[PDB]
Amino acid sequence: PAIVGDEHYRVAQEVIRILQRYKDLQDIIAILGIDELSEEDKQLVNRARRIERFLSQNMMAAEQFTGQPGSTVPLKETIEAFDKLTKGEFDHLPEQAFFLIGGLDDLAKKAESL
Amino acid sequence: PAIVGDEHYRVAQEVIRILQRYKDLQDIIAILGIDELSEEDKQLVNRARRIERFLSQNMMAAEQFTGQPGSTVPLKETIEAFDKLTKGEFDHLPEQAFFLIGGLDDLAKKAESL
Amino acid sequence: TGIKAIDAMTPIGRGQRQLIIGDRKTGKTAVCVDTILNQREAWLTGDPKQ
Amino acid sequence: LADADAMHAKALADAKAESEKVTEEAKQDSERIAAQLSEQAGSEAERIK
Amino acid sequence: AEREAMLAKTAADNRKSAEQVAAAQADYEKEMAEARAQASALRDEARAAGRSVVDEK
Amino acid sequence: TLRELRGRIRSAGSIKKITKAQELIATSRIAKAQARVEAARPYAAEITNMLTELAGASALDHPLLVERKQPKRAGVLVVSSDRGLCGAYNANVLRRAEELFSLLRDEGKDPVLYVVGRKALGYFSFRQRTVVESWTGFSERPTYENAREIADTLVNAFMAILGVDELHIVFTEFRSMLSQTAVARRAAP
Amino acid sequence: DLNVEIVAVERELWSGPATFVFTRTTAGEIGILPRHIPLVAQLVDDAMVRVEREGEDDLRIAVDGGFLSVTEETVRILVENAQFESEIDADAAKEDAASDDERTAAWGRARLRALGQ
Amino acid sequence: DGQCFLESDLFNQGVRPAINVGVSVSRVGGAAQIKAMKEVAGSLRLDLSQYRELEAFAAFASDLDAASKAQLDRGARLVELLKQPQYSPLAVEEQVVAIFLGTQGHLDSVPVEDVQRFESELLEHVKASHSDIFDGIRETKKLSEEAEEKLVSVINEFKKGFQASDGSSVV
Ligand SMILES: Nc1ncnc2c1ncn2[C@@H]1O[C@H](COP(=O)(O)OP(=O)(O)OP(=O)(O)O)[C@@H](O)[C@H]1O
Ligand SMILES: [Mg+2]
Numbered sequence A, B: 001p002a003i004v005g006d007e008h009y010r011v012a013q014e015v016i017r018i019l020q021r022y023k024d025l026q027d028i029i030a031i032l033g034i035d036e037l038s039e040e041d042k043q044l045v046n047r048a049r050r051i052e053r054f055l056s057q058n059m060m061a062a063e064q065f066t067g068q069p070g071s072t073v074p075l076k077e078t079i080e081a082f083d084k085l086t087k088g089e090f091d092h093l094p095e096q097a098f099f100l101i102g103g104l105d106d107l108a109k110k111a112e113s114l
Numbered sequence C: 001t002g003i004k005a006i007d008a009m010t011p012i013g014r015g016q017r018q019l020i021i022g023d024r025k026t027g028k029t030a031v032c033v034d035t036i037l038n039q040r041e042a043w044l045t046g047d048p049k050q
Numbered sequence D: 001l002a003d004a005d006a007m008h009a010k011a012l013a014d015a016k017a018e019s020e021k022v023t024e025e026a027k028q029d030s031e032r033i034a035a036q037l038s039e040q041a042g043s044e045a046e047r048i049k
Numbered sequence E: 001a002e003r004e005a006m007l008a009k010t011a012a013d014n015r016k017s018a019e020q021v022a023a024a025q026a027d028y029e030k031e032m033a034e035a036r037a038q039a040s041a042l043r044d045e046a047r048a049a050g051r052s053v054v055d056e057k
Numbered sequence F: 001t002l003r004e005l006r007g008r009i010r011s012a013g014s015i016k017k018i019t020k021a022q023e024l025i026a027t028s029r030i031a032k033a034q035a036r037v038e039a040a041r042p043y044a045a046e047i048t049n050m051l052t053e054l055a056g057a058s059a060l061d062h063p064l065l066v067e068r069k070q071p072k073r074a075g076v077l078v079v080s081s082d083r084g085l086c087g088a089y090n091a092n093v094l095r096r097a098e099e100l101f102s103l104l105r106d107e108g109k110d111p112v113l114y115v116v117g118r119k120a121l122g123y124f125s126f127r128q129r130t131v132v133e134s135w136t137g138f139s140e141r142p143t144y145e146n147a148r149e150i151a152d153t154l155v156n157a158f159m160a161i162l163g164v165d166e167l168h169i170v171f172t173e174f175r176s177m178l179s180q181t182a183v184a185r186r187a188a189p
Numbered sequence G: 001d002l003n004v005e006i007v008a009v010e011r012e013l014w015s016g017p018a019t020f021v022f023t024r025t026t027a028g029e030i031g032i033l034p035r036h037i038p039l040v041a042q043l044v045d046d047a048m049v050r051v052e053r054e055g056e057d058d059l060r061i062a063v064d065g066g067f068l069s070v071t072e073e074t075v076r077i078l079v080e081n082a083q084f085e086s087e088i089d090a091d092a093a094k095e096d097a098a099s100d101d102e103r104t105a106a107w108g109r110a111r112l113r114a115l116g117q
Numbered sequence H: 001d002g003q004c005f006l007e008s009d010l011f012n013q014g015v016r017p018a019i020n021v022g023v024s025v026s027r028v029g030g031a032a033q034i035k036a037m038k039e040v041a042g043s044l045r046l047d048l049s050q051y052r053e054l055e056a057f058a059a060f061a062s063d064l065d066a067a068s069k070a071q072l073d074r075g076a077r078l079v080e081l082l083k084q085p086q087y088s089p090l091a092v093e094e095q096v097v098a099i100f101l102g103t104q105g106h107l108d109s110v111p112v113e114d115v116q117r118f119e120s121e122l123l124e125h126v127k128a129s130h131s132d133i134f135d136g137i138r139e140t141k142k143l144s145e146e147a148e149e150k151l152v153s154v155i156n157e158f159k160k161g162f163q164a165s166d167g168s169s170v171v
Helices: A006-032 A039-054 A060-066 A075-086 A103-113 B006-024 B026-032 B039-054 B060-066 B075-086 B104-113 C004-009 C029-037 D003-048 E002-056 F002-057 F089-106 F118-126 F144-159 G090-097 G102-115 H035-040 H044-058 H066-082 H092-103 H112-129 H131-140 H145-160
Strands: C019-022 F073-079 F110-116 F131-135 F166-173 F181-188 G002-008 G020-025 G028-032 G039-042 G048-052 G059-063 G067-071 G074-079 G082-084 H002-006
Touching: A006 A039, A006 A075, A006 F002, A039 A075, A075 A103, B006 B026, B006 B039, B006 B075, B026 F002, B039 B075, B039 F118, B075 B104, C004 H035, C004 H044, C004 H066, C004 H092, D003 E002, D003 H112, F002 G002, F002 G039, F002 G067, F002 G074, F073 F089, F073 F118, F073 F144, F089 F110, F089 F118, F089 F166, F089 F181, F110 F118, F110 F144, F118 F131, F131 F144, F144 F166, F144 F181, G002 G020, G002 G048, G020 G067, G028 G039, G028 G067, G048 G102, G059 G074, G059 G102, G090 G102, H035 H092, H044 H066, H044 H092, H066 H092, H066 H112, H092 H112, H092 H131, H092 H145, H112 H131, H112 H145, H131 H145
Parallel strands: C019 H002, F073 F110, F073 F166, F110 F131, G002 G074
Antiparallel strands: F166 F181, G020 G028, G020 G048, G039 G067, G048 G059, G059 G082, G067 G074
């Protein structure tokens, strides 16, 4: 919380906590099924799915294959986007909307496309 | 037994038997806890823990570190105490009662303290 | 040392060798630097006994 | 209903008065906190200089 | 009619009697908690202002 | 020494896998058991309602409603698991049963044991205490037939045959997922 | 119309509305249709229950020593074990009815009665 | 003459400094520690080691005796109290007051989530308004009876005007 901003540290640690809980619940999901979870756990699993798929990015190294120009997401934009995600403000989007997108602009555009 | 007498030897060897049996169970204790053991072994584990903690003593050289004055236990008292303890006459007292107490009178005093 | 935990549980007296032992990135150089920094209140006293 | 009314009025009035007291004490504490932080700011500026 | 009305009135009366006595303590505690909260907010904002002046200076 | 350490690593890994599987199976069976507990609630509520009505109309002289003038025997139905790996479940239940026995003896009553679950049988056998009758094999998944059998036995023992002047049931209340508590209810009189 | 709740000690078997109910209490047969006076009556050890649903044919249920109850809002049948007539095994009921035990014979006879015997 | 064993397991989970109170010890200490610290933190090391041992037992036990719960709560509050930022060395008198808060039970009414803020705010209040306590501790190296009573009064007064993170009062 010294080298990086305090808000950055809070967002990163919240994302890590959510992903850790999601990986803990992987064992229950893959065996007992998703239905067995509680409402809170189901909400957290959806949120973690979206956060984890939102860590993906249309890397410039993929431009040679898809022709889509790679995205450079400024640190502030990443911090704010993941603050929104951990708060659930995008939990109503489809999971596919978060695959290979750089930042909230691409998120909104892909959401509109779907 | 020829040197320290029959009673001292019997008490010492019964204490060693209890402690060795406790050591043999260490993996099961570590994994599943005392709950899984048989009753003949669960009672033994309880009095083994009590014997192990009762072998502790508030050494006079330890005053400078902890502040409690050091206690001296005459041989007859320790032989009688361990004969009583192995037989289970104190397995109703909590473990902390025996910890760094140095004698039967102090044992009862600290049991009252708890 | 200026650290609550060390000055309370494991006090360091002048003339003592107190081993700061721990794995990598466990805060060993941040406990000795804090100790050095905390000596400034004594340094400004100007008294060699402090 | 008269006394309960009297008790409720007294409770409201006493709560307002002791809330004024609480807020005055808290304002004094706030002033002293601000003074301490300003003094610390001055000391830090002096050390930086 | 008036007899019945009086029964009803005394009923609601004792109802308020228990109530208003309960609500007196409830509202005293509510206002006291609100006063403590305003005091804490004042101290917190003053501390924030002090740290802000520290940062600025 | 290295061979022993590697063998123990393999053994501990196998134990970890087995225990994790048991944990997940227990997570499923907790939901199953809680759903079954809730499924029986309507019957209990309705039968309690009509029993209250009948008591309002009854003479309230049934033996189950009147204490024996000099009580000597108090049956105790200790409900315990029939398989291990349950942590302190059995220990808690049996400690509460011992507390109940001490309470009974301080009041001058003599406890007589009825037991459900093999672990409780073992605990009482080691302590040289006899059990009048014991059932097993349904603590993991009880059915109304077993409860009917237990209730018939307890009620008949209460009507008597040496008989019992009282009867309690000592079992684990499932207050919540995080907490369970060993309790004793006097089921008669 | 009646709100008939048929409850087994294990589960809430059935809770559909009905226009009429028929069953043999220990003191006699009873036919219940709405606004009946509040009632509670033990069923015979071999009793069977008929519920005339507002839709298709009435359901016949084998009931083991249940207690019938009626109140302005519902009609309850609290049973140790209840089976829809379609779930009855004829051979099993026949074998049970021949059993020496009173309870087993009563249950088999109840199942036969519900089936159509 | 002693080792402060910093543990990675405690460091990586927020407990910084990660002092392993069970293994960490100072042989020559105790004589060097000032009198006030020796009074307030006399049993702090043993209490924290016992709490760390008890946490494993209570991490899965459904319930425990009243003594066990009291020890667990006291140890959690003490651990949160000893947690300290970096490059923020507290003077010895501030340490004395902070440890006095916990070892004497004044934190029992403060939730675990707010022990850090409670301690920091009380230290600020004592510096700003009741510096006589710090002056006494510094000048005579002892927490005198009058100073202790005044500090207890100040702690009780402050707990009236403090919010837990849940909004409830900590009195
Ligand atoms: N009390 C503390 N609170 C928060 N962060 C801390 C604290 N103490 C240390 N840290 C963090 O720990 C990080 C690593 O610790 P530090 O550099 O002191 O460890 P070290 O033992 O010297 O490591 P190494 O020699 O392996 O580099 C530092 O960047 C600092 O941010
Ligand atoms: Mg280093």
